[PDB]
């Protein structure tokens, strides 16, 4: 879920706004993703990117079609701790995993300027 994983990242890091500090940087933070990750925090989102691309071949999450973006689930921020609830079915609980784990890579790599809006001839 966008929204959801927007919101996990900001419990990590109260200061950021994901959508503009970590869309569009490097070659696999944001829509798709090719080529070889630039730094480590491309490498977490290629991370990002295989784990919803595991969730796709899952039975499980075959039968919903407001996939890995618009399909929801829950979790909880508490003291900026990310934990996944037990009321999510098995294809949510798989999606929140991966964005869980993507938003604490995130917050355990540095940030590279240089990498924000690359030239995607790099990739
Ligand atoms: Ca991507």
Redesign the pocket.
């Known amino acids: 879920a966008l929204w959801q994983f927007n919101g996990m990242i900001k419990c990590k890091i109260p200061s950021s706004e994901p959508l503009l500090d970590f869309n569009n940087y490097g070659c696999?933070?944001?829509?798709?993703?090719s080529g070889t990750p630039v730094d480590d925090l491309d490498r977490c989102?290629?991370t990002?990117?295989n784990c919803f691309k595991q969730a796709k071949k899952l039975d499980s999450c075959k039968v919903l079609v407001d996939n890995p973006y618009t399909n929801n689930f829950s979790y909880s921020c508490s003291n900026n701790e990310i934990t996944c609830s037990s009321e999510n079915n098995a294809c949510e609980a798989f999606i929140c995993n991966c964005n869980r784990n993507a938003a604490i890579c995130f917050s355990k790599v540095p940030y590279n300027k240089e990498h924000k809006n690359l030239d995607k001839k790099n990739c």
């Open positions: 696999y933070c944001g829509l798709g993703g989102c290629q990002h990117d």
